Amino acid sequence: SLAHTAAEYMLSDLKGLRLELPLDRIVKFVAVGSPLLLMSLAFAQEFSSGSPISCFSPSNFSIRQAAYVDSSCWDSLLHHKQDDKMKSLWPHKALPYSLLALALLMYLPVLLWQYAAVPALSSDLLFIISELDKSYNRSIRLVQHMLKIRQKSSDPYVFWNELEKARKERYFEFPLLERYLACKQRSHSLVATYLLRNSLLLIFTSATYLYLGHFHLDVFFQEEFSCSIKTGLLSDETHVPNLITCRLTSLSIFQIVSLSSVAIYTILVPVIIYNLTRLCRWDKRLLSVYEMLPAFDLLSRKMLGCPINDLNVILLFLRANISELISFSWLSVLCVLKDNIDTVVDFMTLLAGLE
Amino acid sequence: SLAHTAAEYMLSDLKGLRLELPLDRIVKFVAVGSPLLLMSLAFAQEFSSGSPISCFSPSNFSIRQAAYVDSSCWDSLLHHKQDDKMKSLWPHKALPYSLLALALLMYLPVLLWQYAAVPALSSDLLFIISELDKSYNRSIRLVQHMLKIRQKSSDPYVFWNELEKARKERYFEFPLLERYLACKQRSHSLVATYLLRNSLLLIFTSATYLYLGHFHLDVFFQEEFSCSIKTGLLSDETHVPNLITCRLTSLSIFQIVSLSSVAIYTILVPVIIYNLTRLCRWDKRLLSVYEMLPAFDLLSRKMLGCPINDLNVILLFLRANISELISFSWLSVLCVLKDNIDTVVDFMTLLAGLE
Amino acid sequence: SLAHTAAEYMLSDLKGLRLELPLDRIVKFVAVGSPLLLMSLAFAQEFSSGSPISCFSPSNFSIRQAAYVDSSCWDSLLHHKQDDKMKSLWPHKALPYSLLALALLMYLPVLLWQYAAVPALSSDLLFIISELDKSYNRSIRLVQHMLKIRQKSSDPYVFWNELEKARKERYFEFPLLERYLACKQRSHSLVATYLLRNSLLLIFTSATYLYLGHFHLDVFFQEEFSCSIKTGLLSDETHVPNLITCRLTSLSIFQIVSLSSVAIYTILVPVIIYNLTRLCRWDKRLLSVYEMLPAFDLLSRKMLGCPINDLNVILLFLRANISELISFSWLSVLCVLKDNIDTVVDFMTLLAGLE
């Protein structure tokens, strides 16, 4: 079948970065493979093939004449409906092609995301991850002489005033990363790609609904139609002027395909809606631990104004990559600290699991 | 089908160099795979196969006689048109082969680009990238003692006169690269390959238009034609001398293929036009940051006269490779400096992110 | 189809050596894949299959009798030509097999080149490349004390007499490589393989021409022939003694295959002629730079007498491998020196790009 090569040509499966969220991957997979799977199911060995159109020719007709009669009407599907208003049954002939066309349209947004946002996002993620990876040996290699002096001191002069200049010395501060984040916050060149990628899917789903409503849902319970042959050089002949009781064999496949196409997209729409709305708010589910690390406090510091910024998408893509191999470490281990108090445990946990 | 093996034989997918721009890759992919996909669609399981030609034989004829009648006219497609001027319907028989021929012609330019310009361009890119990679530890490993002396000095003697001999000493100058660029600027042996590769595509598109206009567009709404059998040893027989009402079954596929072939190339032409026009001007979108680095100033310095040189193509291919793994660094990070002023920030940023 | 597995069994695609010139690769690819592609095109889904031979049986005959009549003549293609001289139409039945036979013959020379010349040529190339790779740190690591003494000297005693003993001392001379080249120059054991590989292709092309001229070109416009059945146990029967108007369905495929087979080889012959003539002359397109390097002067020194030697083939295969990764260096960069004068530039260029 043709829908087999296209499957791995379209929907087939850096070096440490995930540039596609799992929900987006699932949405793309479903929205691309559903029409291909439906097309494969419709016209394969599962349902017996043969002649999609059959006609009840008179017994006087021969085999060749009957074949000509029933083959000159499949490419001219046009019901001479008396219920002389001639109605067309063309979707039955255009059901496969349209499906393939849909498989094209749902692949248009994906390429856009792979051609207008992947390189810049990859560069930003690489730079930010490289800068953040140096933040480990800066809270345990520098702030380590806090409890080493706390025991020979008291409350105010070792943990509420001493821990003020060590935090403001040229080992805790990252000015280049701060300025990079400040400059990227103003930019809006990447959120437009995300908005377009979701809006194109919404528009294509709406167009699919319109196509399935305007053209289908009319020829759906119609399985019989009457055609004519004497509309040309065969008019001057002695035979039936209007063919009688021609029946469509594959109406069940048509109905099943239409129902599945409706159901799949009516299920898929809310997921895309949620993906679009994910960028409408600032995320602070783990800001409590972020506001204490040397380099991670900058990310939580710059959360002001509207959330529609490049910084929002950068943070969203960085969160899914914060567990690669190196940040897949202590950062993922500060889950036991979930309820002054940070005098010991917050630092014994840090100095216990060094490496 | 034949369309399957040829696909991966033709349009199938150093070690760090990109020698094909994404636009050229897309253009080649579309222009090569469109005829293959069309000819696969035309003669696959999507549309029911069988006899492409059907005839209305008299009821006296047997099955074998009717098969002989309808099979001796498919290889002799010739309409005895009374509207005795005999017209030929040969494109219906030559529709697949022609498509395949097109799939060959569009592959001719690509091989040329892979056999007349790839090695020299690869060598030039390798040498230039290797020379430019040494430019990092020459503006921060050498010019580092400007701000280290600026504080113990004033305006004229540390940043407007001192920064004159350090820029003209045997650590800032690259004479070999300068002479290589000067000699390559005069050469014109590589722009000819680009011009030929685009002009061949233009000529082939024009030839496709001429073929689709002269031969098609005439037999397009014609689906019935009358043939003759008594033109040889069968003349001395008692049967119909001129066959009646022979109909072409696959006219819809013909129309769809012609329309798709027209539309795809009418869409593709402007992209190739833009690819041709890309080399008619000098590019200075990032020259502002280029005119300050030690080795990158030479690229911006030699932009004079006509832009039709080997240096233009070399710069075009180098820009797409300036973000590999090592130039995928600080060079891509001087985006925050976009608005004397360079007294601190232009050097603080340089000495902040060393490695 | 059978011609699909044979394609990748025949024409499918050390570790740093190229033992096949691109022209030879193209010639082999075309000459091997053209018959296979023609065979695939002739007998695949592109042209509708069925019965290659059709006959006009009398209406009294049944379906089984007509099938027997039209099936007992395909394996006995023999025209009882009255224009009683019985003519044979056997090529129509032998068109596929012959093609396959050709696809075997054109593969005979290639195996020879892979079994009689590949190992010795690989060994020679490896040894010569290994010896030549040591020539880099012998003109810049040794002759470097020439400009270092030129400034404190004059014309005759530092660059026309001093550069006479440093060139005749045990750092410039390669005696083993010189003797190896001298002994390989006399040998003629490898040029015979090249000559045989080209002459076999010429002979096979001539044989193809003879086969296509003697047997084809006679049954080319003939599409009808009369056969006989009553030539055995069926003689004692009451039916037609000579069958009437049997027609060959696939004449167009025959004509197309013959025309393509003629055209492809008539295009290919000049390329093989040029490949043969490539070895009839000494190549000195880059001898000007070669005669100055320490170890590369020996290659240009031994160009005397007839050019039909093993040294010619060794040089031809070495030139295509002179740009691998290490000779893909300065050697490829002495293109700027193309117009005493070598006093300055020829040495600063060498000592600038060391590594």
Add this chain to the structure above:
Amino acid sequence: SLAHTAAEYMLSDLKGLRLELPLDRIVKFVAVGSPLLLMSLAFAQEFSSGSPISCFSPSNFSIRQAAYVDSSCWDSLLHHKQDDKMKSLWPHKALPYSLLALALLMYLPVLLWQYAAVPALSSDLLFIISELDKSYNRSIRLVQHMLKIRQKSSDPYVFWNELEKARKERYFEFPLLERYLACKQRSHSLVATYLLRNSLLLIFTSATYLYLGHFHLDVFFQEEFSCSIKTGLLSDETHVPNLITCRLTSLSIFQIVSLSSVAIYTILVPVIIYNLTRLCRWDKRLLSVYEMLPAFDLLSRKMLGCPINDLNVILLFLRANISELISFSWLSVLCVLKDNIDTVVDFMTLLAGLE
């Protein structure tokens, strides 16, 4: 087809060792793939398929009756020959299976060579190669102080008497390798595998000849035969008691297959004969250079008595592996010395190309 999977299941393609000579590889390839290729050619799309047997049923018979008549004789191929001696045409039905059986028999010896001689031969080759690889720095790292003393000496006391004790000192002698070779010379456990592997191929070729002579060559020009149906429950019926003029459709394929099977093996036999006779003599084509190296003289020393020993096969397999990566060196470069004399050049060459 079934012959497609079996191809790569049977004939499909340590880490530095070649345990199969090229001639043996070619012989196995041809003798295994020829029957498979013939079977694929016989019953594929190249020749039109259908009913291998056709019969001329009377016009009174229906389609079902004719099909039953012509289908009840294909599985009962038995000619009631009047030239009442009933002759059997069973090979026409057993042509494919027999071919497959042959494709099994020719694969029997190969497995034997892979199960009774590969491990021991691999171990012996590994040990011998490892011992011989240490022989390089023993004629140039030890004998190097011969010409260093020759110049301060004369003819007898530095090159004809001094070069007697250095050769008999504990750096030139290899006792373990000598004893291993002496013990392996007596053994005969591996030459039996080679003899059996060749004799099985000879016996199978003889059996193929006997099968093609006794059963074929009789039904070769016979294409018509008369069968009977009334030999059971259908005897009490009113129809033809002896069927008339039943013809075999695929006689040409039978003849072509038989001729190709004869020709391929009549070509292959001399190659196997030469492979068998290769072990009947001692090889001394390069003993002249072998008798001078420190460890390689032992191989040439033990060439006495009959040549049917394990040492012969070990040497044969070692010679093809003497050019791997390390012995692919000076050993292969000692070709310039092909015409006291060895005073200088024989050692200048050795000490020139050290590494």
Add this chain to the structure above:
Amino acid sequence: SLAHTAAEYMLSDLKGLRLELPLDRIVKFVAVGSPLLLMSLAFAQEFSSGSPISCFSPSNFSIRQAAYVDSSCWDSLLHHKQDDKMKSLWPHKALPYSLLALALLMYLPVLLWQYAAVPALSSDLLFIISELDKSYNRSIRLVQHMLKIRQKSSDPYVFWNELEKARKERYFEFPLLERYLACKQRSHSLVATYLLRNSLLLIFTSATYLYLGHFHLDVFFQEEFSCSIKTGLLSDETHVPNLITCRLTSLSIFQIVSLSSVAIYTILVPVIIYNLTRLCRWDKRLLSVYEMLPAFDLLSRKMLGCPINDLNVILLFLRANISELISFSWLSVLCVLKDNIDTVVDFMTLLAGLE
């Protein structure tokens, strides 16, 4: 066909361990792939397909009526045998499925061996190999000062009394390995898996024999049978009440499949019997050289009592892995010592080939 995917799903082809003996691999391969190959051969292109059952309908019947008659008896294979005892011919319909079922049963034991014995055996082999690999530098790195003292001594005090305490000192003894072997000797948890894996194959072969004897061998020479149609709603009709002369087309395939199935297993049974009997005796074919090495003497020491222990299987699997890369050394070279005497040679050889 279904036989293609199941082949590589079933019989498809750590990192240094061989956990399957070659005989077991061959037995599994044959016993799994024989039914698959037979069922592929039975129903593939090699023998022409069509209707497996044919009937001689009366000439009055039409094509549709004859097809209904001959298609309503294939799923109701039941011979109304008059030689009114009705006999059933159901195996002809169940021949493929049964074969597939066999291809499942023969795969049941293999999975067991891969799920109940592979991990423990792999762990034991890894530990034993790791412990034994340290035994090299303990007989030549420790016992080396025997001959170094033998020359300055006599018979009793250097080689029959001195070599008594060096063999009982903390470089020759391995207590952990000795205790591991002692504890594993008592265990019987792994021999049960081997016994079950062989007994399941024996039982399945016996079941195959019973199935081929009870159901086959009765309908083997029977090719004609009479069926009935008037056994339902068609009873009240005017036609033949008992169908006449219905013949089975594919009896030859049935006979060939039965004969091959019998022959393959009657050949295979002795191999499995030998595999079972391999574990009934202690193996001491190389114990003579084993009783002298430092760590290998323990393996030979613990050979007492019944041989049905885990140690037997461990030794069997270790012997096939004693030639990997490191034990593929000197241990495989003590083959020259095959005929006080060990005074020199047994030590000269050991200290000759160190590494």
